[PDB]
Amino acid sequence: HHHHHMGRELKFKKDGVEISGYLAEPEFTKGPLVIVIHEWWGLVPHIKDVCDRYAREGFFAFGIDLYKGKTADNPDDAGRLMQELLGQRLSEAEAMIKASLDYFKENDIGFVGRVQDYRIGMTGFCCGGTCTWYFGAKFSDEFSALAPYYGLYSLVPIDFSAIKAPVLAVHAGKDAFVPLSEVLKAIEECNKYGVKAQFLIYSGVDHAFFNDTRPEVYNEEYAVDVWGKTVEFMKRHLT
Amino acid sequence: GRELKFKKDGVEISGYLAEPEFTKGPLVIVIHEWWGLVPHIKDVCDRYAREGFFAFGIDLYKGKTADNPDDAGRLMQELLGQRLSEAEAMIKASLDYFKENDIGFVGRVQDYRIGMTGFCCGGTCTWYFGAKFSDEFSALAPYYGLYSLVPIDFSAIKAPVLAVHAGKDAFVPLSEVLKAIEECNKYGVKAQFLIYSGVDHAFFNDTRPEVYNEEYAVDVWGKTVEFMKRHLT
Structure with a gap:
């Protein structure tokens, strides 16, 4: 089918930084690229699943690892990882984002025929929503759409x-x-500042309501709703 | 589109009904801004009909319109301040009329599916009537109500x-x-709030170049149609 998609682990070095993460690729619908940024747990199966879901909708989706291979399953460990990323290692994370973009562009990943140019979006959840806003502002000539979920x-x-x-x-x-x-x-x-930002606030739900692996906060109805809205928005701005 | 005018349960109902291709389908009540039932609102009804909805642009001003804010403010204050019970009765009688004519009846679910949307004053009305007639509506889409x-x-x-x-x-x-x-x-209301940065009141109104924003108008229309389809079909 036109929705066919696969996934693969990337690991390489570029411009002095180590890049790793999960790349989900459409088989037939080789469209724009979306960078997907994990929550404070790290690059876990849920985030790779989100990448797969983007690929089924016709997007390349790169789940970048910002934790150098580490994951956490409890808040104490996760808090330590996140504080280290956003405190000590922020300039390194910026360099990883920049090197990632350069890598994809050199491989013509994200090149869109209709506009004869690259179209790269970014989305993320929790900590990854913060990162979407932050990197979106830092690399403002590189991104054509931003979708931060419940960032601080x-x-x-x-x-x-x-x-x-x-x-x-x-x-x-x-x-x-x-x-x-x-x-x-x-x-x-x-x-x-004239930022073209739409804020979508869902009543009655908690942080991380999109995460289907967390039954204590997952809300099916709004997760399905917001996915629909997000895909439409990425198609509108990236194709 | 048909200009309806009739009486039911002691109140005069008038407005503009836009009809989709088929004889049956969901109904959306569309409530005007403080100008009254003007061409823009009838156009919105037509747009709903092209998406497969019956759309009724109800006149709440008994045939009056305004083209300037002073007159429009007077009409709105009279409606909301003095004639609100009458407006409620018009909404109720309208719903009864459509149901009796099998408009709003959705074959798939074997039941009525009626939504309501409106702009400005009409957004206020959507919230208000949504709360007053809470057993009647399956979806509400108020735009920039007070x-x-x-x-x-x-x-x-x-x-x-x-x-x-x-x-x-x-x-x-x-x-x-x-x-x-x-x-x-x-109170557990299943409400999603969409706030568009940088734009003014009435940014959906394509006849008002001072406030219309094409990019967000196109965006919000897409989201609204998807929402109405999700809940009414």
Whole structure:
């Protein structure tokens, strides 16, 4: 079928940094590229599954590993990994993103015939939503669509003034980690700088409601809804 | 499209009915802005009909329209302030009329599927009537309604809601949208809030170049049609 897709582990070095992650590839529908950034657990099966889902919709999807091969299954370990990434290793993570983009472009991954140019998006969840905003602002000439899910705005400074891509920002109405007052502040910054950002806030659900492997927070109805919206948005801006 | 005019249960009903290709299908009630039932709203009804919905642009102003804000404000204040019981009766009589004519009846589910959407004043009305007639609606899509005009009983709402807001809305501060989200959280309302940065009130209205935003109008239309299809077909 036209939806056929496979996946493979990448591991290589470029411009002095080690890149690894999971690349899901459509067999027939060789479309735009989406970079997918994991939660604070690391690059676990759920995130690779999300990549596969993108590939079935006609996107190359790269689940980049920002934790150098480490994963966590408990909050104490996960918290340590995330703090190290966002504190000590942020410049390294930036370099990994940049080297990844260069790699894909050199391999013509993400080249779209209709526009005769590259079309690369980025999405992520939790910590990965923070990263989507942050890297979206840092590499504002590289991305054509951003879809951060329930990122925190208070961890690293997001340069809203630099964002050039359209943004679909997904938030949970009862998010324990991201108060609605923080979302409001992000909206006001987007208003101030003319960022083309749409904020989608689902009432009644918690942080990580998209994660189907976490029955304590997963919400099927909204997960299905938001997937529909996200795919449509990525198609609109990347094809 | 047909201009309806009739009486039921002591109230005069009028509005514009746009009809899809088939004789049967879901119904969307479309509520006008404070200008009244003007060509733009009838066009929106036509757009719904092209997507397979019966769409009824109900006139809540008894045939009056306004082309300037002073007149429009007077009409809206009279409707919401003095004639709200009458408007409720018109909504109820409209629903009864369509049901008796098997409009809104969806074969797949062997039941009525009626949605409601509206803009500005009509968004306020969508929330209000959605709460008042909570056994009647299967989907609500209020666009940039005010929450401070009429009492919205969030606890009564039973339909899913797609609430559209403008990030730089001069009439609806973001603090009011926040409060509505918190009420939906509190009472278990299945509401999704969509807030578009950088745009003003009425950004969907393609006849108003000072506020129309094509990119977001196209986006929100796509999302609204998908939402109505999900809940009404």
